[PDB]
Design a binder for this molecule. Structure first.
Ligand SMILES: Nc1ncnc2c1ncn2[C@@H]1O[C@H](COP(=O)(O)OP(=O)(O)OP(O)(O)=S)[C@@H](O)[C@H]1O
Ligand SMILES: Nc1ncnc2c1ncn2[C@@H]1O[C@H](COP(=O)(O)OP(=O)(O)OP(O)(O)=S)[C@@H](O)[C@H]1O
Ligand SMILES: Nc1ncnc2c1ncn2[C@@H]1O[C@H](COP(=O)(O)OP(=O)(O)OP(O)(O)=S)[C@@H](O)[C@H]1O
Ligand SMILES: [Mg+2]
Ligand SMILES: [Mg+2]
Ligand SMILES: [Mg+2]
Lengths: 746, 360, 135
């Protein structure tokens, strides 16, 4: 019962000689955050590192980098003893040698480019026989600390002369390489990688214990997503990091053979993974082998599908084999493969969000050298609809434009192998600014599931509606116990209705931002574009995406288009509304999926939507008042530089009966007047400066930097109301008599 | 289905063993019996694995006995007697119908204003007779395709014959009626196929068919022919005694204060249906939850802003629903059935059976 | 058509010999002319032999990574008739569109083809280039 045996978890820090610990474990273990610890591992191999602190780190777990993890012959979830050692002295001679595979391109220097900035103000604790890694110069490079004269371990001081001359040596056959793929090469998919580790790590770490329990493990894991999102990468990383045997079956490579060779290749893969248990068999591109029953023709294709089903069912009589697979959508797989005892667990890898895209861009720009203006958060906010492969291509294209301009400088003697041109080489912001425009993203039709970025501050007015939406959406998530006590059940749906342009889409986004839930937006034209024989699996697919990503807000915008397409034979409108109604009835509230609709025409809505148990909360969103107009105009003008002279309350008194869209239109029109005036002034000053050279005052400056009362008072003369007064009386009537539409009605 | 329940048990067990490896990971690698001895599966493991489970039979039609008794329904006292004499009597006493020489009827049609308790009655008579119950709604029949509706309607009538004595209940017929005429061919195809299957059905299995409509003016008249749904029961807006019974029925699980006068609420709500009385109960319960969560935020704030309080007394500040909540929820009440509609339903209550000729 | 006119096993081996021969002589360019005769849509192929050639071409395109300095170009009359598994990443992923020429283009074509001829002195090719539309 010792407090020094610890177990490895994933690393957050980026350094090669820093381990992390939580503070109570250090205080029990008598360690301070400047110490120099010694770490023992399997096959009697040990390491030396600098410890620091963390709060996200637990006590039963230590977080260390992959380079330390591979110098200890340790994988994820293994045992390591830690002990303090202030017995570390400085050095005199330290002999390093590169490793033969990483040094086949460059020749010339290795000391000043690589080793010189690495040990400067670092004092990295090294030991004899350790491999370390340096990034820089569009390449990563390995070295091994071969010999220390104060043997065996020391701290690299400026006293130590570092021998970097000799032959790059060969590897030992059990040295784990650093060009392999691990968990740090994957970004933007934290949750899914956690699920796959939970499913897979225990039945492959502990086969004997888990056989001795008597529980069944999973055996079929189907990864799916759009093309190019890193599924082959995830399977390869789980295989390398658990250390299991790994056999790869490729889809076209099996279907390209002749007949009896295809059957025997499948059978040999499953037998060979019997022999070397534990294993992982990865079937890449499954829908080339086993597509739909109606899309196969012949004897050979159906015979291969039946072969694969026999082997998947016969895995039960085997020991410790996981079968993974990958496909671009689940609906094209033969549905007999997704039963029980076959591919029964599904993991969905989607397109990344903004945090994900920044993390991809940081992965691919490791070995490159960036210029000092390049801010990758702006690139990550610009690139929308990019999967990971597109971001890798964008980084590669920017690097090639930089090397092309340096061949515009240096072309004559650049043909030799120089390290200096690589030293000077840098990628500016305009290269990324170029390659952003000449890039063709590939996931724009895909439905986006993310948290929105519209807070409550973008919305002005509407103060009781916000309270009502909190009490509908947020309260049965945070406080389920009150609803258990008082004996009621929460409701499921809301319908917003009202005049055009008053802020319904913004409210539906802001409550999803408030509750930190996902958000799926569907518009009426998107449902009507879905075809005659195609709308069915599509509406079911949207309600499935809502169940997988719960707690969710599923928002049906623009229902008046679906209503107007009925009656001019409008059969597709009736088919879509009936199928939405059936899916709402089937939905059980124990996943916290919450449904919202919105309409500008509350007179032609289908009354069966308003039934209790369906969208039966009716919130009327009206034209704003004078205080509300002041709040709207303040909300739209937060980014614009506005002069002090502007009176907003005067604009609110002058604009009566406007909606929110018209107030935004007035702001847009005034800003165009400002840009026109500025460009006239720049043409006039350029003309005058060029027509009178040698001017005594070279004073470049903003002539008008802000928006004054002239611009708003001119933009006010072109204002037009969007909602006429007869319409205002009709919306006031429906505000009270909408709920009576279900009987005979009107 | 059974395989999903086996997977749910297996997942809960693995979460328990994962938390015990969060405790014991170092020497758990050996074969110990003691870790197995200490090992136990709590309720929160099942509470976890219930949420991360994907069930696989939600589209399947459910054939079971319902769980809605007569006590959930308030009012409607002769309608219950009439449903007993239609459904229960030719099951328990076939000999009387053999003696007196009549034949029992097969169908019932409920009709009336929205929200008055038709679905509950169709479930409660199936609970009373201990028979199976199959519920079909109009949108489910219209979702069935162009070339697909045929075997589906025949499949439902086959499921009714296999599971007899049964109650086969067609809810929401006004959707099938409105889809006719805006070319609404699927509506006419579905109604004609239902009519053919009713004609083919022989009463010697005890299958009993019920329908329900909120729009008794656009119903297809050929449904009302003798031998088809030819018993017409009109279900009206409730009276004052009935409103008292409804409000007592909805509030059986809720903890309600002594101070509340329900007869006052019945006198104040006139022309409401049952759905509106349930809406008033829901609104009052939301006001109670709001008040309780404000009080807990305020006591947490005050207890945390003044540490070392002399009275650590955690307690329900408000455990029940008093007159404030109902009298505030009453100010937002809205009727669902306007008065012109009430006159029209009173007219159809007498002249529905004349729709088969030229009619109106 | 020269590959699809052969018999079955000769078609497979002709594709494979082309990719191996361009391994031997790197750098190279392999030009696959009329791609939509070899690999058309999945719903427009019938049989074993046609799908087996499409799967053969996909295996070779994916296996180019393990090779050195080979570019593969291709040509087709519209992109929508190609089997959509060929336009992923690591396969035919860059598209270049060559359209019909405009008026400056047509004058430049007409100057190319009338090099070796002798024109009379009235022949003004700009009038011809403005006349020919849809060429
Ligand atoms: N999440 C990611 N993080 C980092 N790199 C990624 C990520 N996703 C994709 N990539 C890069 O994109 C390349 C291609 O990804 P793939 O693993 O081929 O995705 P994919 O699932 O194979 O798509 P298909 O359908 O097989 S073409 C990878 O080799 C990485 O370089
Ligand atoms: N209450 C409001 N506060 C601030 N901006 C608003 C408000 N209402 C409308 N806007 C602006 O007007 C635009 C239209 O708002 P939406 O919420 O999309 O309105 P809508 O109800 O969906 O009606 P339409 O038909 O979509 S214009 C928003 O993008 C805002 O720029
Ligand atoms: N007589 C009643 N007694 C008790 N609760 C009732 C009564 N009528 C209606 N309710 C309540 O109101 C809800 C709606 O009842 P239903 O029987 O489904 O009415 P309905 O006739 O089907 O009309 P709709 O269109 O379905 S609301 C029920 O779930 C009950 O909660
Ligand atoms: Mg792949
Ligand atoms: Mg909108
Ligand atoms: Mg009902």
């Amino acid at each position: 019962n010792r407090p020094n045996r610890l177990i490895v978890d994933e690393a957050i820090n980026e350094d090669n000689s820093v381990v992390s610990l939580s503070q109570p474990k250090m205080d029990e273990l008598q360690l301070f955050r400047g110490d120099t610890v010694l770490l023992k591992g399997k096959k009697r191999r040990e390491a030396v590192c600098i410890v620091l602190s963390d709060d996200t780190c637990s006590d039963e777990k230590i977080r260390m980098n992959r380079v330390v993890r591979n110098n200890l012959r340790v994988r994820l979830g293994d045992v390591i003893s830690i002990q303090p050692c202030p017995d570390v002295k400085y050095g005199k001679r330290i002999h390093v040698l590169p490793i033969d595979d990483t040094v086949e391109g460059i020749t010339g220097n290795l000391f000043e480019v690589y080793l010189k900035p690495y040990f400067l103000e670092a004092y990295r604790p090294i030991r004899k026989g350790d491999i370390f890694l340096v990034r820089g110069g569009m390449r990563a490079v390995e070295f091994k600390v071969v010999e220390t004269d104060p043997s065996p371990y020391c701290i690299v001081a400026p006293d130590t002369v570092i021998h970097c001359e000799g032959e790059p040596i060969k590897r030992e056959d059990e040295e784990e390489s650093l060009n392999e793929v691990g968990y740090d090469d994957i970004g933007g998919c934290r949750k899914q990688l956690a699920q796959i580790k939970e499913m897979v790590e225990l039945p492959l770490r502990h086969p004997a214990l888990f056989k001795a329990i008597g529980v069944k493990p999973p055996r079929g894991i189907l990864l799916y997503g759009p093309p190019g999102t890193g599924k082959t990468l995830i399977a390869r990383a789980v295989a390398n990091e658990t250390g299991a045997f790994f056999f790869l079956i490729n889809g076209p490579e099996i279907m390209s053979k002749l007949a009896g060779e295809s059957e025997s290749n499948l059978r040999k893969a499953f037998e060979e993974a019997e022999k070397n248990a534990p294993a992982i068999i990865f079937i890449d591109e499954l829908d080339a082998i086993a597509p739909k029953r109606e899309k196969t023709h012949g004897e050979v294709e159906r015979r291969i599908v039946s072969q694969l089903l026999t082997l998947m069912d016969g895995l039960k009589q085997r020991a410790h084999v996981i079968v993974m697979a990958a496909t671009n959508r689940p609906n094209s797989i033969d549905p007999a493969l997704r039963r029980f005892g076959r591919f029964d667990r599904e993991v969905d890898i989607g397109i990344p969000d903004a945090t994900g895209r920044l993390e991809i861009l940081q992965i691919h720009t490791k070995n490159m050298k960036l210029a000092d203006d390049v801010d990758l958060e702006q690139v990550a906010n610009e690139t929308h609809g990019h999967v990971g492969a597109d971001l890798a291509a964008l980084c590669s294209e920017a690097a090639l434009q930089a090397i092309r301009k340096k061949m515009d400088l240096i072309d004559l003697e650049d043909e030799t192998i120089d390290a200096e041109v690589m030293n000077s080489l840098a990628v500016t912001m305009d290269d990324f600014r170029w390659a952003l425009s000449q890039s063709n993203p590939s996931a724009l039709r895909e439905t986006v599931v993310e948290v929105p970025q519209v807070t409550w501050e973008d919305i002005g007015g509407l103060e009781d509606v916000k309270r009502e939406l909190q009490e509908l959406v947020q309260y049965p998530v945070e406080h389920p116990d009150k609803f258990l006590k008082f004996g009621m059940t929460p409701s499921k749906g809301v319908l917003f209705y009202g005049p055009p342009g008053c802020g319904k889409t913004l409210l539906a986004k802001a409550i999803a931002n408030e509750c930190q839930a996902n958000f799926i937006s569907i518009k009426g034209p998107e449902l009507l574009t879905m075809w005659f024989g195609e709308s069915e699996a599509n509406v079911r697919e949207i309600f499935d995406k809502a169940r997988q990503a719960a707690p969710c807000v599923l928002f049906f915008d623009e229902l008046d288009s679906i209503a107007k397409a009925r009656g001019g034979g409008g059969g597709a409108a009736d088919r879509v509304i009936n199928q939405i109604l059936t899916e709402m009835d089937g939905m059980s509230t124990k996943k916290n999926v919450f449904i919202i609709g919105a309409t500008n025409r509350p007179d032609i809505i289908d009354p069966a939507i308003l039934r209790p148990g369906r969208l039966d909360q009716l919130i009327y969103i009206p034209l704003p008042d004078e205080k509300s107009r002041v709040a709207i105009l303040k909300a739209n003008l937060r980014k614009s530089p506005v002069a002090k002279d502007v009176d907003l309350e005067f604009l609110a008194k002058m604009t009566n009966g406007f909606s929110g869209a018209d107030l935004t239109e007035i702001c847009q029109r005034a800003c165009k007047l400002a840009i026109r005036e500025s460009i006239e002034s720049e043409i006039r000053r350029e003309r005058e400066r060029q027509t009178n050279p040698s001017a005594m005052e070279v004073e470049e400056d903003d002539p008008v930097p802000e928006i004054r009362r002239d611009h708003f008072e001119e933009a006010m003369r072109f204002a037009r109301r969007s909602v006429s007064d007869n319409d205002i009386r009709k919306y006031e009537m429906f505000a009270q008599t909408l709920q009576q539409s279900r009987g005979f009605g009107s």
